[PDB]
């Protein structure tokens, strides 16, 4: 039967409409908040870099500079020239690149040989040259400071201070996206962290930010038969469940669970203190929308049958309750439903082998991101709380540099909506469109992202305004909240998994406990890989390897098991900083002041363990990298897809005759399309190999020495694939 989602994804002019006014008032003075445009400032710094290349040629001091920063300069110049559309300007870059080549070929014969092996491999040789620690050396900004001897504008200074960590941050849109996508490939040893003069810098979040600022404002349009748009009739609760008082098994919080001769549960959920009937009716109709479209959506959770929604006198409720006794009035609207007992076992429960846990976790993350494509967001899967935790917090505020201290982490996923059955209790839904518009949800929890960017550094006494690149996020804030929802889903998974781990390893064989925690590490990475596949289509196997290029599975295993169980509290403060080196192999130890509560660990309330010191980072650092790796792989793959298709039309207009140009250019239009294919995605290069052969049909005239080799390796790879395909 038909199987598709009821949401179409597109783009819109601007997310910054009906937002709060861009103004920061403080000490009675209202300061306007102004955008520093990303691409405009970016281009100013690249032309300044270009002039600086020219003042380096005139200085005739190319020997004074190490051989592999003329390799960086030349390779970037060649890459930039290829990215340039019109011939007149790409020749003014090759003007600048030729003295660097003349010198390298004459005074550095070996480096010249290595560089040319890259120039015939790719049209953007700089992105593969920088698939390693070379990326941490900012050759562009170094040259700018040395030869552009004139002070930067207030915004080049702003752009520089924000994106100081790598020259890739100044690359034009295609070169940066291509570099960022391929920096997860198997040859690439790049990881966004370098060690400074004894200090360690992490800039995984900057990769995401520098990507997001080049994106266009997304927007989701819901089908007219969508759950939030289709006019639904009244609820026909024509039957009333007869509440016996011995059929009730249990009472899981304003919900009473009743037994049945069919070994499943009829549950009856009672009105909260502050709660309208609307909410319980929405939960009813959600359960029906799920049921109706369960095949249509390939939803895997066990879905409850909504039985009835009606009102019940509070006397009867309180009468049929005894044993563990948030209801308010003498009349209480009710939502009664039928569901397996799996629906009421929280996914973090000790009584699951890790065969059932993995199976049930896989169920949850599938329906979480399938329903996201469907356009439905569950913003309260867990109570990780105004002070509501932000998974991707450095991209949403100006101040924070790392992710905050999760408070009472085990209590957050306590009544998590994730069960052995799968997704559960889906009443508190939110339309995905609410994240891309100025809804009540967004201006409450994300008011800075929607107002935008005050800090004293930003303030310009001359102007009277506070200027920052942050205020640019007003036109794109929906894109930020989209990615944050993705990371938020996977962090609730992680706390749920860690909760299970703590309660299973407690009262246990040290090898048996350690082996459990590394399986928990694997199911977490497997979960993120699943998300990437549901969101992009990348084979989950490859999504996993792309992920493990960036996130260290084994570092994550050993900081999860160390911080989410209380054994470290029984250590004195200074055998503890002997153990931290084992879990932060190169990275700095996790510094913290707080006094440890014995048997608990770090605990502000002295009863419940937290993740992090009182006003510190969360100590789960490679978890933080995991989420950004996940979220960047998604958004990065989608931008690469867009640049792929944007260039795909170019080669198709040249091919058809709609754009006349030379032979030697039509082939480099096609070869450029090769560079925007996804990493590890073969059919994309099968498609451009087809374009290559058609171009040789169009231009038999043309010599093809520059692209024969790079397109042979695609041809030989495709031939080898199909002989391996003959496994019979």
């Amino acid at each position: 039967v038909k199987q598709y989602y009821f949401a179409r994804r597109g783009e819109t002019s601007t997310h910054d409409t009906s937002l709060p006014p861009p103004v920061k008032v403080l000490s009675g003075r209202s300061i306007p908040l102004k955008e520093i445009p990303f691409e405009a400032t970016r281009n100013e710094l690249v032309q300044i870099y270009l002039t600086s290349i020219d003042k380096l040629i005139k200085s005739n001091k190319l020997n004074s500079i190490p051989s592999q920063q003329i390799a960086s300069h030349y390779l970037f110049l060649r890459s930039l020239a290829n990215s340039e559309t019109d011939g007149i300007k790409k020749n003014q870059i090759l003007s600048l690149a030729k003295p660097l080549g003349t010198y390298l070929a004459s005074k550095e014969p070996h480096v010249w040989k290595m560089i040319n092996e890259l120039i015939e491999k790719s049209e953007y040789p700089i992105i593969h040259y920088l698939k390693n620690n070379r990326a941490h050396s900012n050759f562009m900004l170094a040259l700018i400071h040395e030869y552009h001897k004139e002070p930067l504008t207030k915004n080049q200074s702003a752009f520089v201070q924000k994106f100081r960590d790598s020259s890739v941050f100044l690359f034009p849109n295609p070169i940066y996206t291509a570099w960022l996508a391929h920096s997860y490939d198997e040859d690439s040893s790049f990881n966004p962290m370098f060690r400074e003069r004894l200090s360690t810098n992490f800039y995984h979040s900057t990769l995401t930010d520098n990507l997001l600022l080049r994106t266009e404002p997304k927007e989701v349009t819901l089908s007219s038969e969508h759950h939030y748009k289709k006019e639904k009739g009244p609820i026909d609760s024509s039957f009333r469940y007869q509440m016996s008082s011995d059929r009730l098994l249990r009472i899981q919080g304003r919900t009473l669970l009743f037994s049945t001769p069919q070994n499943d549960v009829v549950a009856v959920k009672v009105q909260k203190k502050g709660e309208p009937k609307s909410t319980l009716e929405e939960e009813f109709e959600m359960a029906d929308y799920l049921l109706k479209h369960q095949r249509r959506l390939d939803v895997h959770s066990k879905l409850p049958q909504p039985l009835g929604q009606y009102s019940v006198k509070k006397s009867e409720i309180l009468e049929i309750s005894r044993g563990s006794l948030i209801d308010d009035s003498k009349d209480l609207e009710v939502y009664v439903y039928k569901a397996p007992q799996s629906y009421f076992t929280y996914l973090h429960d000790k009584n699951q082998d890790l065969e059932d846990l993995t199976a049930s976790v896989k169920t949850n993350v599938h329906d979480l991101f399938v329903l996201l494509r469907e356009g439905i967001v569950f913003p309260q899967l867990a109570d990780i709380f105004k002070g509501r935790y932000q998974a991707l917090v450095q991209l949403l505020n100006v101040l924070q540099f790392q992710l905050g201290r999760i408070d009472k982490w085990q209590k957050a996923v306590e009544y998590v909506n994730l069960r052995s059955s799968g997704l559960a209790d889906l009443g508190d839904s939110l339309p995905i469109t609410s994240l891309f518009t100025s809804s009540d949800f967004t201006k409450h929890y994300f008011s800075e992202l929607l107002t935008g960017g005050y800090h004293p550094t930003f303030f310009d006494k001359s102007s009277g305004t506070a200027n920052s690149l942050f205020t640019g996020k007003r036109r794109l804030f929906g894109n930020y909240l989209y990615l944050n929802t993705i990371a938020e889903y996977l962090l609730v998974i992680q706390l749920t998994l860690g909760s299970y781990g703590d309660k299973v390893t407690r009262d246990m064989d040290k090898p048996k406990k350690e082996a459990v925690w590394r399986e928990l590490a694997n199911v977490m990475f497997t979960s993120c890989a699943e998300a990437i596949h549901i969101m992009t289509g990348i084979p989950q196997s490859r999504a996993l390897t792309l992920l493990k290029q960036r996130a260290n599975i084994e570092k994550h295993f050993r900081q999860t098991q160390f911080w989410m169980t209380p054994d470290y509290s029984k250590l004195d403060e200074d055998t503890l900083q002997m153990e931290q080196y084992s879990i932060y192999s190169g990275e700095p130890e996790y510094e913290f002041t707080d006094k440890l509560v014995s048997g608990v660990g770090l605990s502000v309330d002295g009863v419940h363990q937290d993740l992090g010191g009182y006003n510190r980072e969360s100590p789960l650092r490679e978890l933080e990298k995991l989420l950004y790796a996940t979220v960047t792989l998604i958004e990065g793959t989608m931008q690469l897809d867009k640049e792929f298709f944007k260039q795909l039309e170019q080669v198709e207009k040249i091919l058809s005759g709609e754009i006349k140009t030379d032979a030697n250019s039509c082939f480099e239009a096609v070869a450029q399309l090769l560079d925007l294919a996804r990493p590890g995605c073969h059919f994309q290069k099968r498609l451009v190999l087809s374009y290559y052969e058609e171009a040789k049909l169009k231009y038999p005239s043309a010599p093809t020495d520059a692209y024969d080799s790079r397109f042979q390796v695609v041809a030989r790879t495709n031939a080898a694939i199909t002989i391996q395909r003959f496994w019979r």
């Binding site: 199987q3 598709y4 084979p539 495709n718 080898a720």
Partner: protein
């Protein structure tokens, strides 16, 4: 039934060329996706239409129809004819090298 290796390939190709999300892939686009998968037909105007466009369930059924008609004697051949660089001179120890980095490994039976 297809193999797991090529339903994965077909699933990603479908996901990539569906430019706006939900299975809303229009007949104008399916030419290029099959081109990316090794096909180049003339007339294909059937097999679900589902409104006038098709879902993935229809795609992965559309395909084995176009793959249960491939007389692959000329497909598996041509493939060997690539590495036969000179002509009709078959391959050698190199024909185990290539099969050791494209998509597979693990004990080829070099005959």
């Amino acid at each position: 039934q297809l193999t797991e290796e090529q339903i994965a390939e077909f699933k990603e190709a479908f996901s990539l060329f569906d430019k706006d999300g939900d299975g809303t892939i229009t007949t104008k686009e399916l030419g290029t996706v099959m081109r990316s998968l090794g096909q180049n037909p003339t007339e294909a105007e059937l097999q679900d239409m589902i409104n006038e466009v098709d879902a993935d369930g229809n795609g992965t059924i559309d395909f084995p129809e176009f793959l249960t008609m491939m007389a692959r004697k000329m497909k598996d051949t041509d493939s060997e004819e690539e590495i036969r660089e000179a002509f009709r001179v078959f391959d050698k120890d190199g024909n185990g090298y290539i099969s050791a980095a494209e998509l597979r490994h693990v004990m080829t039976n070099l005959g």
